[PDB]
From a paper:
The genome of phleboviruses, like other bunyaviruses, is tightly packed with N into [name] complexes (RNPs). In this study, we have elucidated structures of the hexameric RNA-free (apo) N and of hexameric N in complex with a single-stranded nonameric RNA. As in the RVFV N structure, each N monomer consisted of a core domain comprised of two α-helical lobes (the upper and the lower lobe), and an amino-terminal α-helical arm which was divided by a short linker, hinge II, in α1 and α2.
Oligomerization was driven by the amino-terminal arm, which bound into a hydrophobic groove of the neighboring monomer at the outside of the hexamer (pockets I and II in Figure 1E and F). In the apo N structure, Tyr32 from hinge I, Lys204 from the lower lobe and Lys79 from the upper lobe of the adjacent subunit are in close proximity to each other and cap the RNA-binding tunnel. Furthermore, it can be envisaged that the proposed inter-subunit shift is energetically not favoured over the planar architecture, since we do not observe it in the apo N hexamer.
Residue numbers in the entry:
A (entry chain B), D (entry chain E): 4 to 251
B (entry chain A): 5 to 250
C (entry chain F), F (entry chain C): 4 to 250
E (entry chain D): 4 to 252
Amino acid sequence: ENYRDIALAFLDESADSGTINAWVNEFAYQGFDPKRIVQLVKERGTAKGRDWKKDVKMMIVLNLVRGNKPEAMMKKMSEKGASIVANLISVYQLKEGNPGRDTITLSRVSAAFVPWTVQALRVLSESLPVSGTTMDAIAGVTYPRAMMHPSFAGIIDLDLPNGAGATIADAHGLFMIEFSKTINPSLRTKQANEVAATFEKPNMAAMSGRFFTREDKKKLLIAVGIIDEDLVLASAVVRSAEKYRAKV
Amino acid sequence: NYRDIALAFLDESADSGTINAWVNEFAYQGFDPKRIVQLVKERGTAKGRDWKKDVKMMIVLNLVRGNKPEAMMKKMSEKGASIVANLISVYQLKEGNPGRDTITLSRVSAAFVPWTVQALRVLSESLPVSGTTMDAIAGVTYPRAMMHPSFAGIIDLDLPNGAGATIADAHGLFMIEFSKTINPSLRTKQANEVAATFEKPNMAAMSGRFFTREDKKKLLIAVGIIDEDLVLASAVVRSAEKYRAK
Amino acid sequence: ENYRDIALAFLDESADSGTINAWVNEFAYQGFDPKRIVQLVKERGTAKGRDWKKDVKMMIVLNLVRGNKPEAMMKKMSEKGASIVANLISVYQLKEGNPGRDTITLSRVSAAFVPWTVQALRVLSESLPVSGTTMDAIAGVTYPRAMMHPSFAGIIDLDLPNGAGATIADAHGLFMIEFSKTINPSLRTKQANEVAATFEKPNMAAMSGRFFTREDKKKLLIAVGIIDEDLVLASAVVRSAEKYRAK
Amino acid sequence: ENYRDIALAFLDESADSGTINAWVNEFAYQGFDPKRIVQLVKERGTAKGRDWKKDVKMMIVLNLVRGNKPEAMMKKMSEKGASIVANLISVYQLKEGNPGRDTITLSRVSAAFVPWTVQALRVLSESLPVSGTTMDAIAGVTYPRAMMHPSFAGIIDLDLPNGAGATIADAHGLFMIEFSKTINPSLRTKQANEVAATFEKPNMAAMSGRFFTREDKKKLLIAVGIIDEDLVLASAVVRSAEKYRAKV
Amino acid sequence: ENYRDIALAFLDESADSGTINAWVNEFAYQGFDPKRIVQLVKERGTAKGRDWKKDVKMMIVLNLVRGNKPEAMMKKMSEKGASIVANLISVYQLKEGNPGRDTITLSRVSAAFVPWTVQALRVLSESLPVSGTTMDAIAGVTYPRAMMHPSFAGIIDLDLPNGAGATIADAHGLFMIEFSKTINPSLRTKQANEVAATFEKPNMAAMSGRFFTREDKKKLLIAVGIIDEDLVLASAVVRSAEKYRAKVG
Amino acid sequence: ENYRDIALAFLDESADSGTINAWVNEFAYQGFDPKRIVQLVKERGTAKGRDWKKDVKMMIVLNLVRGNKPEAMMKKMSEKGASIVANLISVYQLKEGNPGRDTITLSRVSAAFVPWTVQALRVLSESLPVSGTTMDAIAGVTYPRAMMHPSFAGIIDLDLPNGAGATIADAHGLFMIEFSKTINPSLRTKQANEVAATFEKPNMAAMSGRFFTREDKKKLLIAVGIIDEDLVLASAVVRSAEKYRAK
């Protein structure tokens, strides 16, 4: 009954933006820890008699083409390929979807080891669920092969000058709205507004990743062709972003 | 023959006050703010713990992740998911709106609103409905203070000139979008049906006997909704007239 | 030996509207018996050692504010109040909705003991699901507080001169179309035509009630302010009815 | 193995139109015998002290307002009325739905004693499940009160000149598609095509009724206002039929 | 490998249209065996014993008017007629729908003993679910009474010269699209395209029937009035077919 | 600890272009091996009776008309035909659907032995689930009988000049969207967009088949009438493709 004084005295408490924003980044939506993924791949890989660095490449390529269901893709695959996939499931304990944070999935391998994933996309652009030529028709120009995977969202700096990261994020969104339509045909009927909201939460988690620094992401964006040394966005990036803005 | 038993009920003591004493007793009340503060105080100090900081953390956790403690942990940083699990243990956190003595993250923000109303000034862009989003929907920069259902617990409806009704409508401009986000099934519905989905528990917070009419006056002034001369901010009135257009 | 002679002769058979209408009202839709409700409240109240006349008042007030779901309203109510509600559920065996005719619900208590319900509305007009000031905005004038509940339909005489009962019925319909929109938000999207048909069957049952006589209903309408002794409708009633006819 | 020759030999087998039509008269879809209903009402009514001619009226009025479930309607009815209903159930052995042909239901009483049922509808038009004013809104004009019951189908002559009987049948169908929507809300979602066929089998049985002759039905249609002495359809009938044809 | 050379050599492999159609009809969808139906009616009928030739007539007439649900039609029928129906269910073990091939249904009796079914339709044209006058309004002329039942599909030769069998099949389809709309009210809402596909599989089975020969069907089509001795289609048949083609394609 | 550096060290990593595509062709979606099907038909066929080359023909005809459920189609088939079907199930161990890759199904026989399947369609066009005349109505012209089966997708070269393979693929898609609607009536309600995505994965597997060479598929397309010797698409093919693009 006299709890009025207790609640009213919370009007003057520390509402500092330092610890509060420190808590939101702590309570931030995080599907998995990239540091944990690399560790478990390294540990379970070297303790098993394996060249994990090669297996990482194979798991990424496997994920970029077949998806994230290791047990399901084996039933419809060449026995020559289905054999080594069964191996990768055994040694690295592969699971499907997004379960626990210490469980290794094919999508998290591509997200953790993105600097190689961003290079593999440059090659097998026509073997993706959404082909390269398809994105070249949707966009006004030839859509950047680097952005043709959700793992690309883990190397984009939103704190770039002039808000360049927001432009790249929108440019990357042009692919994601089609990638979501393909991997989930139920979203095809929905317009771009509803589709964009189906991934804007886990994708935003990769953008605000504390795994790569602001300078590390700068090197990654330059070396792949999204941006140059003078931090100037490519013509393909800006034109792909303005087409995404025309869908919101 | 049962007419006299029933028809003679015309002269019965329609005592004004005791009838309303039953009405104020039967009023729709999701929870008791006095009970929430007590249980946070008791279970917090009996556990050897700094509850005042935990209140801050529980409010921040609620303002960003929602009201499902067990569900938000599965998709959160282990550094953060650890202390959330702590808050669930000591204060016995539950989800939704169950019993009145069960502490939920939404009730902590509602009970300890004077701090919740200050936190919104900071993490405006981390909310389910971002600050800039409300700045586009409203004609001006929508008051950050109103960007949570807990704001309804500090608004005086008995304000002169029906100013409380204006603030209530201004707060409704956010709630119709907050309901659309936390529940995408209401997105298809127009503003009329969405406004009726919260107008019952929200009205309960407005007619709260927890804060007095004078206590709510101090809270509205210190946060920027109204001034000392009881004059509504330009952002409040313009946000209300846009809600009346729905 | 009974081919056409019996059935074909029913063209010459009488079908006057005097005896027929008495059978329709006899064969009428009846949600519950007001005589049965009062009896069960009286019996179960005095046999349990409590003042039922006070409980009747509390059950009516409880119904006028919270509705007709006793088990649900307790979960969101003050423990001081949720305690005495649990009591009312125990002794009078309260149920929800409109089940059997001998099952006592909060809505039937207000309907049976309407002469007190019609007085309580004069007080708690702003605590109703549809507030008094709300009806004052919808109607051209201050809408009669007496009509602010479906229980009011049980005291209106349709056999009033000049069809005055039809006017009061329409005036009462102005509230019911909004009361149905509030207690059931799914009807909010529907226009007044579809909403009016959602209650025009149980409400018509209360209008043609054989519980109160034509003279008893006359006394009730006068003592509450709907009509005067000269059977002249109040200005608030007629103006509220003409707004309902426009829907 | 020579069974092929046996079936082919049915070309010369006899099939005169007299005996064949004699078999269809045994196989025609008949829910009940109107002659049997009238007899049982007369017998069981006169074998008791009951005035059956008055009870027939009450059973028809009871059916036109409450339906065809005597045991169920009593539980939600005034005790003054529920008392005499219980009586009608006792003496005439009333049942519900469409069971045996020798079992008397409230719907069959209205169908057998239709010349009185067709007159009662003129009075209690606003007490029906489908009100009179409702049919006045659906149809372009004031829909004939006589047609506001499935029992009306038992007095319409399909062998009328210029196919006038087909017009009245369609005009009566405008009410039945709404009557079926009300007594069975599950058919409300269905469009008029599916609803019209839910009754087109028992209704067609009443149309081809050998109970009333072609001349007896002529007298009934004239005396109630559906058609005049020169066999000219009323303006309300034809306009209600053309609105029903706009639903097929 | 050498299996590519092996598989590619199936281009030079023989595939005459004669043996293929024999495999199509051999691997064909078959609801029941007409030979089996006649046998079981003969055996179970004479062992009672029954005048089965008369019972066949009654079962056909019963099917042409009430349908294919013996247990259901009895509940709404005159006791004088419902009695002999109950008998037919007992002796010939009548079932409903299309279950096993050795189970006798009222629809299969009319299909097996079609030469009598095709004659009965000439009489009870106005007692059918789809009346004769109804088909006379839908079609430009008086629609052939012979075609007013799905059993008619069992006597039409598709191998007739000038593709005349395809014309009769389309002419018979004009009735089937309305017969399906009546016996199944859910198909009324659907257009003729979707309705025509609901029966085009069991109906095609009756057309390619090895029960009646190409010549036996010729005698049947002539004796009932669909075609003449010079294999010239009736004016009513062709005009009913061109009206069916204007809904289909 | 410094697992960040490890991830960044994959920037200057040996990312090939040959071996990667070698992994893609290894991980490519493959329902079955056409080489394996022909082998098992040859082995299990000669090891019992038997004229397998005739059985291949019968199994193809059986698949083109009844589908891919050997055990189910027997229950509704002539005993004369159901007998030899039971035989084919015995000797070649026939199963249904798409299980293992070493299990022989009726759909895989038609896909493996497509050069004969592509000739049978020219005859039994009106016995198919989707009749020939039906496709003649959907398309502006007489739709190529050769394309009237999913097995046709195994002989189309996507690496054809002027992107002709993409045109034939779209032309073949005009039939598949109707074939999927018939064999699975649940897809009938769905529009062409959703239906086209239900088969675009196993069908694309047949298009990129390493079984037939680019030159072998050329001979097959010419000899059946889809394309001529000058690699010019038939008028029926291009017009059927532009109608598929309209969906």
